Coordinates of C-alpha atoms in Angstrom, one line a residue:
Chain A
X1 CA -26.9 0.1 7.1
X2 CA -26.9 3.2 5.2
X3 CA -24.7 3.7 2.2
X4 CA -21.5 6.2 2.0
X5 CA -18.1 6.4 0.3
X6 CA -14.7 7.8 1.7
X7 CA -14.4 11.5 1.9
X8 CA -10.7 11.2 1.3
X9 CA -9.1 12.9 -1.5
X10 CA -8.3 11.3 -4.6
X11 CA -4.4 12.2 -4.4
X12 CA -4.5 10.3 -1.1
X13 CA -6.0 7.1 -2.3
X14 CA -4.1 4.3 -4.1
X15 CA -4.5 2.0 -7.1
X16 CA -6.4 -1.3 -6.7
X17 CA -4.3 -3.2 -9.2
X18 CA -0.8 -1.7 -8.6
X19 CA 1.4 0.0 -5.7
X20 CA 0.9 3.6 -6.8
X21 CA -0.7 6.8 -5.7
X22 CA -3.4 7.9 -7.9
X23 CA -2.4 11.0 -9.9
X24 CA -5.1 10.9 -12.5
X25 CA -8.8 10.8 -13.6
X26 CA -9.3 9.7 -17.1
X27 CA -12.5 8.7 -19.1
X28 CA -12.4 5.7 -21.3
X29 CA -14.4 5.0 -24.2
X30 CA -16.0 1.5 -25.2
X31 CA -12.9 0.2 -27.0
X32 CA -12.7 -3.0 -28.4
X33 CA -10.7 -4.4 -25.2
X34 CA -13.3 -4.7 -22.7
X35 CA -12.5 -3.7 -19.2
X36 CA -12.1 -7.2 -17.4
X37 CA -10.2 -6.3 -14.3
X38 CA -9.8 -9.1 -11.7
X39 CA -8.2 -7.0 -9.0
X40 CA -9.8 -3.8 -7.8
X41 CA -13.3 -5.4 -8.3
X42 CA -16.0 -4.5 -5.4
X43 CA -19.5 -4.0 -5.4
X44 CA -21.2 -1.3 -3.5
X45 CA -22.5 -3.7 -1.1
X46 CA -19.0 -4.7 -0.4
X47 CA -18.9 -8.0 -2.2
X48 CA -15.4 -8.7 -3.5
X49 CA -15.1 -10.3 -6.9
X50 CA -12.1 -12.0 -9.0
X51 CA -8.9 -11.9 -7.0
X52 CA -9.5 -8.8 -5.1
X53 CA -7.6 -8.6 -1.8
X54 CA -8.0 -6.1 1.0
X55 CA -4.2 -6.7 1.5
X56 CA -2.7 -3.7 -0.4
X57 CA 0.9 -5.1 -0.1
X58 CA -0.5 -8.3 -1.7
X59 CA -1.7 -6.5 -4.9
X60 CA -0.1 -7.9 -8.2
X61 CA 2.0 -10.3 -6.5
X62 CA 2.6 -14.0 -5.9
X63 CA 3.6 -15.7 -2.7
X64 CA 3.9 -19.0 -1.0
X65 CA 6.4 -22.0 -0.2
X66 CA 9.3 -22.9 -2.7
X67 CA 9.0 -26.2 -4.4
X68 CA 11.3 -28.1 -6.7
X69 CA 11.2 -27.8 -10.5
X70 CA 10.8 -31.8 -10.6
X71 CA 7.5 -31.5 -8.7
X72 CA 5.9 -29.3 -11.0
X73 CA 19.5 -16.5 -14.6
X74 CA 17.9 -18.7 -11.7
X75 CA 14.1 -20.2 -11.8
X76 CA 12.1 -20.2 -8.6
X77 CA 8.9 -22.4 -8.2
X78 CA 6.1 -21.7 -5.9
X79 CA 3.3 -23.4 -4.4
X80 CA 0.9 -20.3 -4.5
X81 CA -1.0 -19.4 -1.6
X82 CA -3.4 -16.6 -0.4
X83 CA -2.2 -13.4 1.2
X84 CA -3.1 -14.5 4.9
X85 CA -1.1 -17.8 4.4
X86 CA -4.2 -20.2 4.0
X87 CA -4.1 -22.5 0.9
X88 CA -5.3 -21.5 -2.5
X89 CA -8.5 -23.4 -3.3
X90 CA -8.2 -24.7 -6.9
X91 CA -11.5 -25.8 -7.4
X92 CA -12.8 -22.7 -5.5
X93 CA -14.5 -19.4 -6.8
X94 CA -11.4 -17.4 -8.0
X95 CA -9.5 -17.5 -11.3
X96 CA -6.3 -17.3 -9.1
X97 CA -5.0 -16.5 -5.7
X98 CA -6.0 -12.9 -4.4
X99 CA -3.7 -10.2 -5.6
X100 CA -2.5 -12.4 -8.5
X101 CA -1.5 -10.0 -11.5
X102 CA -4.6 -9.5 -13.7
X103 CA -2.7 -8.5 -17.0
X104 CA 0.0 -9.6 -19.5
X105 CA 3.5 -8.2 -19.3
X106 CA 7.0 -9.0 -18.0
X107 CA 6.4 -7.8 -14.6
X108 CA 9.9 -6.7 -12.9
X109 CA 10.2 -6.9 -9.2
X110 CA 12.2 -8.3 -6.1
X111 CA 11.8 -12.0 -4.8
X112 CA 11.8 -12.2 -1.2
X113 CA 12.7 -14.8 1.2
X114 CA 12.0 -13.1 4.6
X115 CA 11.6 -15.3 7.4
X116 CA 14.4 -17.9 6.8
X117 CA 16.6 -19.0 9.7
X118 CA 19.6 -19.8 7.7
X119 CA 19.2 -15.9 6.8
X120 CA 16.9 -13.6 5.0
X121 CA 17.3 -13.2 1.2
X122 CA 16.0 -11.3 -1.8
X123 CA 16.9 -10.8 -5.3
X124 CA 16.1 -9.0 -8.4
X125 CA 13.3 -10.9 -10.2
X126 CA 10.6 -11.0 -13.0
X127 CA 7.4 -13.0 -13.7
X128 CA 6.3 -13.4 -17.4
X129 CA 2.5 -13.4 -17.3
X130 CA 2.4 -13.6 -21.1
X131 CA 1.1 -16.9 -22.9
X132 CA 4.8 -16.9 -24.2
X133 CA 5.6 -18.4 -20.6
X134 CA 4.0 -21.7 -20.1
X135 CA 4.9 -21.9 -16.3
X136 CA 2.7 -19.0 -15.3
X137 CA -0.3 -21.3 -14.2
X138 CA -1.5 -19.9 -10.6
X139 CA -4.9 -21.3 -11.4
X140 CA -3.3 -24.8 -11.1
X141 CA -1.4 -24.0 -8.1
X142 CA 2.2 -23.2 -9.2
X143 CA 4.0 -20.3 -10.9
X144 CA 7.6 -19.6 -12.0
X145 CA 9.4 -16.6 -10.8
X146 CA 12.7 -15.9 -12.7
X147 CA 15.7 -14.4 -10.6
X148 CA 17.7 -12.2 -12.9
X149 CA 21.4 -12.9 -13.0
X150 CA 21.5 -14.8 -9.8
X151 CA 19.9 -16.9 -7.1
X152 CA 21.6 -20.4 -7.5
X153 CA 21.6 -22.2 -4.1
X154 CA 18.9 -19.8 -2.4
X155 CA 15.6 -21.4 -4.1
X156 CA 15.6 -24.7 -2.1
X157 CA 12.4 -26.1 -1.3
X158 CA 10.3 -25.5 1.9
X159 CA 10.8 -21.8 2.1
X160 CA 8.2 -18.8 2.2
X161 CA 8.5 -16.4 -0.8
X162 CA 6.9 -13.2 -2.0
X163 CA 7.0 -11.6 -5.3
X164 CA 6.5 -7.8 -5.1
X165 CA 6.0 -5.7 -8.3
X166 CA 8.1 -2.7 -9.1
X167 CA 7.7 -2.4 -12.8
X168 CA 6.8 -3.7 -16.1
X169 CA 9.5 -4.2 -19.2
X170 CA 9.4 -2.0 -22.0
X171 CA 11.4 -1.6 -25.2
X172 CA 11.2 -2.9 -28.6
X173 CA 12.7 -6.3 -28.2
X174 CA 10.8 -7.1 -24.8
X175 CA 6.9 -8.3 -24.6
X176 CA 4.3 -5.7 -24.5
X177 CA 2.7 -4.5 -21.2
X178 CA -1.2 -4.9 -22.0
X179 CA -3.1 -3.9 -18.8
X180 CA -6.5 -4.5 -20.4
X181 CA -5.6 -7.9 -21.4
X182 CA -6.1 -10.9 -18.9
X183 CA -3.5 -13.6 -18.8
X184 CA -3.9 -17.3 -19.1
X185 CA -4.0 -18.2 -15.2
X186 CA -3.9 -22.1 -16.2
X187 CA -1.2 -21.4 -18.6
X188 CA -1.8 -21.8 -22.7
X189 CA -3.2 -25.5 -22.6
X190 CA -5.9 -24.6 -20.2
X191 CA -9.0 -22.2 -19.4
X192 CA -9.7 -19.5 -17.1
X193 CA -12.6 -19.8 -14.7
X194 CA -14.8 -17.6 -12.2
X195 CA -13.5 -14.6 -13.7
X196 CA -15.2 -11.4 -12.3
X197 CA -17.5 -10.1 -15.2
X198 CA -16.6 -7.6 -17.9
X199 CA -17.4 -4.0 -17.3
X200 CA -18.9 -2.2 -20.1
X201 CA -21.4 0.8 -19.5
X202 CA -24.8 0.0 -20.8
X203 CA -26.4 3.4 -20.8
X204 CA -25.6 6.0 -23.9
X205 CA -23.6 9.1 -23.2
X206 CA -22.2 7.3 -20.1
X207 CA -18.6 6.4 -20.2
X208 CA -16.1 4.8 -17.7
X209 CA -14.3 6.9 -15.2
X210 CA -10.8 5.3 -14.3
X211 CA -8.3 5.9 -11.7
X212 CA -4.9 6.3 -13.2
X213 CA -1.4 5.9 -11.9
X214 CA 2.1 6.0 -13.2
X215 CA 3.4 2.6 -14.2
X216 CA 7.3 2.4 -13.9
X217 CA 9.1 0.8 -16.7
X218 CA 12.2 -1.3 -16.8
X219 CA 14.4 -1.3 -20.1
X220 CA 17.7 -2.6 -18.7
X221 CA 19.1 0.7 -17.6
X222 CA 18.6 2.4 -21.0
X223 CA 16.0 5.2 -20.0
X224 CA 14.7 5.0 -23.5
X225 CA 11.3 3.1 -23.2
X226 CA 7.9 5.4 -23.2
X227 CA 6.3 6.0 -19.8
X228 CA 3.3 3.9 -18.9
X229 CA 0.0 4.1 -17.0
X230 CA -2.1 1.7 -15.2
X231 CA -5.7 2.2 -14.2
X232 CA -8.4 0.9 -11.9
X233 CA -12.3 1.1 -11.1
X234 CA -11.9 2.0 -7.5
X235 CA -9.3 2.9 -5.2
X236 CA -8.3 0.6 -2.6
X237 CA -9.9 3.0 0.4
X238 CA -13.0 2.7 -1.5
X239 CA -12.8 -1.1 -1.6
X240 CA -12.1 -1.4 2.1
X241 CA -14.8 1.1 3.0
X242 CA -17.4 -0.7 1.0
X243 CA -16.3 -4.0 2.5
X244 CA -16.3 -3.0 6.0
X245 CA -19.7 -0.9 5.3
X246 CA -21.7 -3.9 3.8
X247 CA -24.5 -1.4 2.9
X248 CA -27.4 -2.9 0.8
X249 CA -27.8 -1.2 -2.6
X250 CA -31.3 0.4 -2.8
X251 CA -31.0 1.2 -6.4
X252 CA -28.9 0.5 -9.7
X253 CA -26.3 3.2 -9.2
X254 CA -25.0 5.8 -6.4
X255 CA -24.8 9.3 -7.4
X256 CA -21.6 10.9 -6.1
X257 CA -20.4 14.4 -6.4
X258 CA -16.8 15.4 -6.6
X259 CA -16.3 18.1 -4.2
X260 CA -13.5 20.5 -4.3
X261 CA -13.2 22.8 -1.1
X262 CA -10.7 25.3 -2.4
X263 CA -13.4 25.8 -5.0
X264 CA -16.2 25.9 -2.6
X265 CA -18.3 23.9 -5.0
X266 CA -19.1 20.6 -6.7
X267 CA -16.8 20.1 -9.8
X268 CA -18.5 17.2 -11.5
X269 CA -20.9 14.2 -10.7
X270 CA -20.7 10.6 -11.5
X271 CA -22.6 7.4 -11.1
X272 CA -21.3 4.5 -9.1
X273 CA -22.9 1.6 -10.3
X274 CA -23.9 -1.5 -8.0
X275 CA -21.5 -3.6 -10.0
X276 CA -18.5 -1.6 -8.8
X277 CA -17.6 1.0 -11.4
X278 CA -17.9 4.8 -12.0
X279 CA -19.2 6.3 -15.0
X280 CA -19.5 10.2 -16.4
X281 CA -21.3 12.0 -19.0
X282 CA -18.0 13.0 -20.9
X283 CA -16.0 12.0 -23.7
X284 CA -13.0 9.5 -23.3
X285 CA -9.5 11.4 -22.3
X286 CA -8.1 13.0 -19.3
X287 CA -10.2 14.7 -16.7
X288 CA -8.6 18.2 -16.0
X289 CA -9.6 18.7 -12.5
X290 CA -7.5 19.1 -9.3
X291 CA -7.2 15.9 -7.2
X292 CA -7.4 17.5 -3.9
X293 CA -10.9 16.9 -4.0
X294 CA -13.2 14.0 -2.7
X295 CA -16.2 12.0 -3.8
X296 CA -19.7 12.4 -1.8
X297 CA -22.8 10.1 -2.0
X298 CA -25.8 12.3 -2.4
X299 CA -28.6 9.9 -3.5
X300 CA -29.4 6.6 -4.9
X301 CA -30.3 6.7 -8.6
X302 CA -31.8 4.8 -11.5
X303 CA -29.6 3.7 -14.3
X304 CA -31.8 6.3 -16.3
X305 CA -30.8 9.1 -14.1
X306 CA -29.2 11.7 -16.6
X307 CA -25.9 13.1 -15.4
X308 CA -24.7 16.5 -15.7
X309 CA -21.9 16.7 -18.5
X310 CA -18.5 17.1 -16.9
Chain B
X1 CA -20.2 12.1 15.3
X2 CA -19.8 8.5 16.8
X3 CA -16.6 6.8 17.3
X4 CA -15.8 3.6 15.7
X5 CA -12.8 1.4 14.2
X6 CA -12.4 -0.8 11.1
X7 CA -13.9 -4.3 11.3
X8 CA -11.2 -5.4 9.1
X9 CA -9.2 -8.4 10.3
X10 CA -5.6 -7.9 11.3
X11 CA -4.1 -9.9 8.4
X12 CA -5.8 -7.9 5.9
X13 CA -4.4 -4.7 7.3
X14 CA -1.1 -2.9 6.3
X15 CA 1.8 -1.2 8.5
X16 CA 2.1 2.4 8.7
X17 CA 5.7 2.6 8.7
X18 CA 6.7 0.2 5.9
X19 CA 5.1 -1.5 2.8
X20 CA 3.9 -4.8 4.2
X21 CA 0.9 -6.5 5.6
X22 CA 0.4 -7.2 9.3
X23 CA 1.6 -10.6 10.3
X24 CA 2.0 -10.3 14.2
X25 CA 0.6 -8.7 17.3
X26 CA 3.4 -8.1 19.9
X27 CA 3.5 -6.4 23.2
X28 CA 6.7 -4.0 23.8
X29 CA 8.2 -3.2 27.3
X30 CA 9.1 0.1 28.5
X31 CA 12.5 -0.3 27.1
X32 CA 15.5 2.5 27.1
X33 CA 14.8 3.4 23.5
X34 CA 11.2 5.0 23.5
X35 CA 8.6 4.6 20.8
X36 CA 9.1 8.0 18.7
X37 CA 7.4 7.0 15.4
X38 CA 6.9 9.9 13.2
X39 CA 4.9 7.7 10.7
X40 CA 1.6 6.0 11.6
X41 CA 0.6 8.7 13.9
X42 CA -3.1 9.1 14.5
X43 CA -5.4 10.5 16.9
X44 CA -8.9 9.0 17.7
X45 CA -10.0 12.0 16.6
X46 CA -8.3 11.9 13.3
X47 CA -5.5 14.2 13.9
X48 CA -2.4 13.2 11.8
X49 CA 1.0 13.9 13.6
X50 CA 4.5 14.0 12.6
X51 CA 5.2 13.0 9.0
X52 CA 2.2 10.7 8.7
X53 CA 0.6 10.4 5.1
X54 CA -2.6 8.8 4.0
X55 CA -1.0 7.7 0.9
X56 CA 0.1 4.3 1.6
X57 CA 2.4 4.1 -1.4
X58 CA 4.4 7.2 -0.3
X59 CA 5.2 5.7 3.3
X60 CA 9.1 5.6 4.0
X61 CA 9.9 7.1 0.7
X62 CA 11.3 10.3 -1.0
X63 CA 10.2 12.1 -3.8
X64 CA 10.8 15.3 -5.8
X65 CA 12.7 16.9 -8.6
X66 CA 16.2 16.0 -9.5
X67 CA 18.5 19.0 -8.9
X68 CA 22.3 19.8 -9.5
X69 CA 24.8 18.5 -6.6
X70 CA 26.5 21.8 -7.0
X71 CA 23.2 23.6 -6.0
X72 CA 23.0 21.8 -2.6
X73 CA 27.7 4.3 -8.1
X74 CA 25.9 7.6 -9.1
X75 CA 24.5 10.3 -6.8
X76 CA 21.0 11.6 -7.2
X77 CA 19.9 14.7 -5.4
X78 CA 16.2 15.6 -4.9
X79 CA 14.5 18.5 -3.9
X80 CA 12.0 16.7 -1.6
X81 CA 8.6 17.4 -1.8
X82 CA 5.1 16.3 -0.2
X83 CA 3.4 12.8 -1.9
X84 CA 0.5 15.2 -3.5
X85 CA 3.5 16.8 -5.4
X86 CA 3.1 20.2 -3.6
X87 CA 6.3 21.8 -2.0
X88 CA 7.6 20.9 1.3
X89 CA 7.0 23.8 3.8
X90 CA 10.4 23.9 5.6
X91 CA 9.4 26.3 8.3
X92 CA 6.0 24.5 8.7
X93 CA 4.8 21.9 11.5
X94 CA 6.6 18.8 10.2
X95 CA 10.1 17.3 10.8
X96 CA 10.3 16.3 7.2
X97 CA 8.1 15.7 4.3
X98 CA 5.2 13.1 4.8
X99 CA 6.2 9.6 4.4
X100 CA 9.8 10.4 5.3
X101 CA 11.6 7.6 6.7
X102 CA 11.6 7.8 10.5
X103 CA 14.2 5.5 11.5
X104 CA 17.9 5.1 11.0
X105 CA 19.2 2.4 8.5
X106 CA 20.5 2.1 4.9
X107 CA 17.1 1.6 3.1
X108 CA 17.2 -0.5 0.2
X109 CA 14.8 0.5 -2.8
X110 CA 14.3 1.5 -6.5
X111 CA 14.9 5.0 -7.6
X112 CA 12.1 5.9 -10.1
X113 CA 11.9 8.4 -12.9
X114 CA 8.4 7.4 -14.3
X115 CA 7.3 10.3 -16.4
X116 CA 10.2 11.4 -18.5
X117 CA 9.6 12.3 -22.0
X118 CA 12.7 11.2 -23.3
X119 CA 12.0 7.8 -21.6
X120 CA 11.1 6.3 -18.2
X121 CA 14.0 5.3 -16.0
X122 CA 14.5 3.2 -12.6
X123 CA 17.4 1.7 -10.9
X124 CA 18.5 -0.3 -7.8
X125 CA 19.1 2.4 -5.0
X126 CA 19.6 2.9 -1.5
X127 CA 19.2 5.9 1.2
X128 CA 21.4 6.3 4.3
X129 CA 19.2 7.7 7.0
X130 CA 22.2 7.3 9.8
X131 CA 24.0 10.0 11.0
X132 CA 26.9 8.9 9.2
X133 CA 25.6 10.3 6.1
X134 CA 25.4 14.2 6.5
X135 CA 23.5 14.3 3.1
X136 CA 20.3 12.8 4.7
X137 CA 18.7 16.4 5.2
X138 CA 15.2 16.4 4.2
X139 CA 14.2 18.9 6.9
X140 CA 16.1 21.5 5.0
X141 CA 14.8 20.5 1.5
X142 CA 17.2 18.1 -0.3
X143 CA 18.4 14.3 0.3
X144 CA 20.9 12.1 -1.5
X145 CA 19.8 8.9 -3.2
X146 CA 22.6 6.4 -4.1
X147 CA 22.0 4.6 -7.5
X148 CA 23.9 1.4 -6.9
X149 CA 26.5 0.4 -9.6
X150 CA 24.9 2.6 -12.3
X151 CA 23.0 5.8 -13.2
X152 CA 25.5 7.7 -15.2
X153 CA 23.7 10.4 -17.4
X154 CA 20.2 9.8 -15.8
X155 CA 20.3 11.9 -12.8
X156 CA 20.0 15.3 -14.8
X157 CA 18.1 18.2 -13.0
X158 CA 14.5 19.1 -13.7
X159 CA 12.9 15.5 -13.4
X160 CA 10.8 14.1 -11.2
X161 CA 11.7 11.0 -9.0
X162 CA 10.5 8.6 -6.3
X163 CA 12.5 6.4 -4.1
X164 CA 10.6 3.4 -3.0
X165 CA 11.5 1.3 -0.1
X166 CA 12.1 -2.7 -0.5
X167 CA 14.3 -3.6 2.4
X168 CA 17.0 -2.5 4.9
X169 CA 20.6 -3.6 4.8
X170 CA 21.9 -6.2 7.2
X171 CA 25.3 -8.1 7.6
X172 CA 28.0 -7.5 10.1
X173 CA 30.0 -4.8 8.4
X174 CA 27.1 -2.7 7.1
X175 CA 24.9 -0.2 9.1
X176 CA 22.6 -1.4 11.8
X177 CA 18.8 -1.1 11.2
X178 CA 17.2 0.5 14.2
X179 CA 13.4 1.1 13.9
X180 CA 13.0 2.9 17.2
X181 CA 15.9 5.2 16.5
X182 CA 15.1 8.6 14.7
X183 CA 17.3 9.9 12.0
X184 CA 18.8 13.5 12.2
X185 CA 16.3 14.9 9.4
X186 CA 18.2 18.3 9.4
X187 CA 21.7 16.2 9.3
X188 CA 24.3 16.2 11.9
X189 CA 24.9 20.1 12.1
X190 CA 21.3 20.9 12.9
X191 CA 18.3 19.7 14.9
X192 CA 15.1 18.2 14.3
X193 CA 11.8 19.9 15.1
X194 CA 8.0 19.5 15.4
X195 CA 8.4 16.0 16.0
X196 CA 5.3 13.9 16.9
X197 CA 5.5 13.1 20.7
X198 CA 7.1 9.9 22.3
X199 CA 4.9 7.0 23.1
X200 CA 5.0 5.8 26.8
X201 CA 2.2 4.2 28.5
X202 CA 1.6 5.9 31.9
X203 CA -0.6 3.4 33.9
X204 CA 1.1 0.5 35.8
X205 CA 0.6 -3.0 34.0
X206 CA -0.4 -1.3 30.8
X207 CA 2.2 -2.0 27.9
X208 CA 2.1 -1.0 24.4
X209 CA 0.5 -3.3 21.6
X210 CA 2.3 -3.3 18.3
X211 CA 1.5 -4.2 14.9
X212 CA 4.3 -6.3 13.5
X213 CA 5.3 -7.0 9.8
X214 CA 8.4 -8.8 8.3
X215 CA 11.2 -6.4 7.2
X216 CA 13.0 -7.5 4.3
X217 CA 17.1 -7.8 4.2
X218 CA 19.6 -7.0 1.9
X219 CA 23.1 -8.5 2.3
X220 CA 24.4 -8.1 -1.2
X221 CA 23.0 -11.9 -2.3
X222 CA 24.8 -13.7 0.4
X223 CA 21.4 -14.4 2.1
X224 CA 23.3 -14.8 5.4
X225 CA 22.1 -11.7 7.5
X226 CA 19.6 -12.6 10.0
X227 CA 15.6 -11.8 9.4
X228 CA 14.1 -8.5 10.6
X229 CA 10.8 -7.2 11.8
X230 CA 9.4 -3.5 11.7
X231 CA 6.5 -2.3 13.9
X232 CA 3.7 0.5 14.1
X233 CA 1.1 1.7 16.4
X234 CA -2.1 1.5 14.0
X235 CA -2.4 0.1 10.7
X236 CA -3.1 2.4 7.9
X237 CA -6.8 1.3 7.6
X238 CA -7.3 2.6 11.3
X239 CA -5.4 5.9 10.4
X240 CA -7.8 6.4 7.1
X241 CA -10.9 5.4 9.1
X242 CA -10.2 7.9 11.9
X243 CA -9.3 10.8 9.7
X244 CA -12.3 10.2 7.5
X245 CA -14.6 10.0 10.8
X246 CA -13.1 12.8 12.8
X247 CA -14.9 11.6 15.9
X248 CA -14.7 13.5 19.0
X249 CA -12.8 11.8 21.9
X250 CA -15.3 11.6 24.8
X251 CA -12.8 10.1 27.1
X252 CA -8.9 9.3 27.7
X253 CA -9.3 6.0 25.6
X254 CA -11.5 3.7 23.7
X255 CA -12.1 0.4 25.1
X256 CA -11.7 -2.3 22.0
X257 CA -12.4 -6.0 22.1
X258 CA -10.4 -8.4 19.7
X259 CA -13.1 -10.4 18.2
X260 CA -12.7 -14.0 16.6
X261 CA -15.8 -15.3 14.8
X262 CA -14.3 -18.8 14.3
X263 CA -14.1 -18.8 18.1
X264 CA -17.5 -17.1 18.5
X265 CA -16.1 -14.8 21.2
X266 CA -13.8 -12.1 22.2
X267 CA -10.5 -12.9 22.6
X268 CA -8.9 -10.0 24.5
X269 CA -9.4 -6.4 25.1
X270 CA -7.2 -3.3 24.6
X271 CA -7.3 0.4 25.2
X272 CA -6.8 2.8 22.3
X273 CA -5.7 6.0 23.8
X274 CA -6.8 9.2 22.2
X275 CA -3.0 10.0 21.4
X276 CA -3.3 7.2 18.7
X277 CA -1.7 4.1 20.5
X278 CA -2.9 0.8 22.0
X279 CA -2.1 -1.1 25.2
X280 CA -2.7 -4.4 26.6
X281 CA -2.6 -5.9 30.2
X282 CA 0.2 -8.2 29.4
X283 CA 4.0 -9.1 29.6
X284 CA 6.3 -8.1 26.8
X285 CA 6.6 -10.8 24.1
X286 CA 4.3 -12.0 21.0
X287 CA 0.5 -12.3 21.3
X288 CA -0.2 -15.8 20.1
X289 CA -3.8 -14.9 18.7
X290 CA -5.1 -15.7 15.2
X291 CA -5.0 -12.5 13.2
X292 CA -8.2 -13.3 11.3
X293 CA -9.8 -11.5 14.1
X294 CA -11.2 -7.8 14.2
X295 CA -11.1 -5.0 16.6
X296 CA -14.6 -3.5 18.0
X297 CA -15.3 -0.6 19.9
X298 CA -17.6 -1.2 22.9
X299 CA -16.9 1.8 25.2
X300 CA -15.2 5.0 26.1
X301 CA -13.2 4.5 29.2
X302 CA -11.2 6.5 31.6
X303 CA -7.2 5.9 31.7
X304 CA -7.9 4.1 35.2
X305 CA -10.2 1.7 33.5
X306 CA -8.6 -1.8 34.4
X307 CA -8.1 -4.1 31.4
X308 CA -8.6 -7.8 31.8
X309 CA -5.3 -9.6 31.4
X310 CA -4.8 -11.1 27.8

């Protein structure tokens, strides 16, 4: 099965760690905080890693049946499950259920109870994925969702819920959104397991290319908190493409060219390594290229293939 | 260029008219209200129709720069633009900007101002797409977003906004959600134009196959309103696949088989017509099939190909 990547333009593709369109290409240096994303992890052969789901609407969210606080503003407790509705395998090969948020923040969103015969329900909600919240323990099969300023009488056990992400909190008093900082999936008192491996380009002069999106920020109606971004290694359209394809990797990396039709030419070239990340010969920072261009696979290359400088 | 469809399972794919995973296959009869979807419209050759965008996060939403009410709870006024940030061509070949909602309801969501240097902002919002609100006029380049119980001082002109869908309203007094009922894109005082064509199976015994999702409902914290669904003709993953492929259609329809590996066999068959819709030889109602199966293209067939009963 011959290897390929989607011919879709970047501004048509979506972030694999957050519900948002790609609106930027940035290069990231080998900082102290090593890229260790659990979502948006796919090999060029289409092997999904960590908590990566193909279900785009299940990204950076939680879902499952409500349970009583005993058995573990208004607190909601979920028996977390996978996107397709099947049980989460606790002693399986994932750190958490697929689509589970893979960073620390207070994630603002909507708690949804969409199929209830007594009547559908939803409410403003948030999830604290920082170590500060001991009840964020999806690795052990439960997590706490906070319904903000309501929810009493609606969080009874035995009903299907989703938590769907909108924003992170910002502002001086509130917890820091740190997208490169993994949460404690088992809570403070227990360890993570089966994490997808860190991403750190080995070769000199090669730095990581990330796909950027805007990260909305909630600061309780002030409109004073600084704007945020969120990054991923491969857009979802890449991940679904690679997964469906199942093409054997014939070398350490795939040489892709970023093609811009209005320019009638290739603008830069990059290496997509088998492990599922792109690198460029470029210094850290934003790439000032138009996003109405697409990646094209031209050849299998060695890790020692020297890229043209961006 | 040989034709194909994604080998992705249905419960992994997403709705082309609303932010949700597919959780159902239903067959729809030839009802009085004809399928006239503007989103989720793609031909087997990969031609996008109506307001169809590949940008999944831009589906059933609005975005653009804020403008003054003069130049046209707290009212926000947007100069609507396309997902990629480029201007909406009013006298072009679309009824509205891509991703514009294609049904009548009060759509609940979040108004997001994510890039503002003075500080990012968001707020609880809704969009009335019924004829009752004359200010839903995206065909003419502006639309009103209502910020619910706040927003004063934040809706100033010259800033980029998005409206992102969460739910529709429900409850006896509130306006009815009608997913097969197109809005007046130019408002009450003007006509629509360049609508994607109605979908209505011609051949006897062939009825429309639709991909179902849950539709969340907002009823102001009551939780008493009846649960809802929303449907589309083809999942986004189909649409991206067909678009990237650009495969010539060798016949009126593509014969697909729904394959279930756990059963080690084909469960039913369908015809995907060139115009971008699937039909089954089956009566109206829910198809009780497991959604961990995938569609497979086996042959080009005429419109007179007799399908096996489901």
